[PDB]
């Protein structure tokens, strides 16, 4: 099971402003949709409520400590262990955010899909710092910038840098 971070962030790692994306880039969201197709989306409750609804074609799994928390068309997990058990047969899952959710899955992450937006927005939640020396870029692509997607941004994908033995 591949554990993958799926994230869009600005030049200071902003991922949200008052439980919202500070930007509107439909093309980016269509990239997310294409990329996570057939695979679970793992998200914290706040991330989920900020998104607004179950994202179709997709196993939506909500991570909250709240044991009474239920929403229709979703699965709820209360810990990382619970998620791994729910996804026992999955090829790959996408940790979909909540800064706190990324931190929870950090010791398990194998793959990073990071959209970097070349701009500084106002924000209050951040993608946590990571040591990128442990990571190796395998794919990059400049996002579509137009009327509907005003900012410049790039899709990046990273895998573990393998150590050469001494």
Ligand X SMILES: COc1cc(Cc2cnc(N)nc2N)cc(/C=C/C(=O)N2N=Cc3ccccc3[C@@H]2CCC(F)(F)F)c1OC
| Spatial contact of 40 and 84, defined as CB atoms under 8 Å apart | no
Instruction: Using CB under 6 A, pick the residue from 2, 50, 71, 74 that binds ligand X.
Output: 50
Q: The tokens of 69 are what?
A: 């928390």
Instruction: Using CB under 5 A, pick the residue from 11, 85, 110, 141 that binds Ca ion.
Output: 110
By a kind-dependent CB cut-off of 5 to 8 A, residue 25 interacts, out of Ca ion, Cl ion, ligand X, none, with none
Instruction: Using CB under 6 A, pick the residue from 40, 44, 97, 143 that binds ligand X.
Output: 97
In the bound state with Ca ion, the residue whose beta carbon lies nearer, of 72 and 89, is: 89
16 binds Cl ion (CB under 5 A): no
CA distances from 99 to 45, 50, 110, 114, 149 (A): 12, 13, 17, 14, 24
Instruction: Using CB under 6 A, pick the residue from 13, 23, 45, 51 that binds ligand X.
Output: 51
Q: Which stretch binds Cl ion (CB under 5 A): 36-44, 51-59, 79-87, 154-162?
A: 36-44
CA distances from 96 to 4, 64, 161 (A): 9, 14, 23
In whole angstroms, give the CA distance from residue 31 to residue 39.
14
Minimum distance, C-beta of residue 41 to ligand X, in the bound complex (Å): 7
| Spatial contact of 45 and 69, defined as CB atoms under 8 Å apart | yes
Residues of span 101-130 touching ligand X by CB under 6 A: 115
3-state secondary structure of 90: coil
Check residue 57 and report its DSSP letter: S
Residue ranges for the known binding site are 8, 15, 19-20, 45-47, 64-66, 98-101, 108, 110, 125
């Amino acid at each position: 099971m591949i554990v993958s971070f799926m994230v869009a962030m600005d030049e200071n790692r902003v991922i949200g402003k008052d439980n919202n994306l500070p930007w509107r880039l439909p093309s980016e969201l269509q990239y997310v949709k294409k990329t996570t197709m057939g695979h679970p989306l793992i998200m914290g409750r706040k991330n989920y409520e900020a998104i607004g609804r179950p994202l179709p074609g997709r196993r939506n799994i909500i991570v909250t400590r709240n044991e009474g928390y239920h929403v229709e068309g979703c699965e709820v997990a209360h810990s990382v262990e619970e998620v791994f058990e729910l996804c026992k047969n999955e090829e790959e899952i996408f940790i979909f955010g909540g800064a706190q959710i990324y931190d929870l899955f950090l010791p398990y992450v194998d793959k990073l899909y990071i959209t970097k937006i070349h701009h500084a927005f106002e924000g209050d939640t951040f993608f946590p710092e990571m040591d990128m020396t442990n990571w190796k870029e395998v794919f990059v692509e400049k996002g579509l910038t137009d009327e509907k997607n005003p900012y410049t941004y790039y899709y990046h994908v990273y895998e573990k840098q393998q150590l050469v033995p001494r």
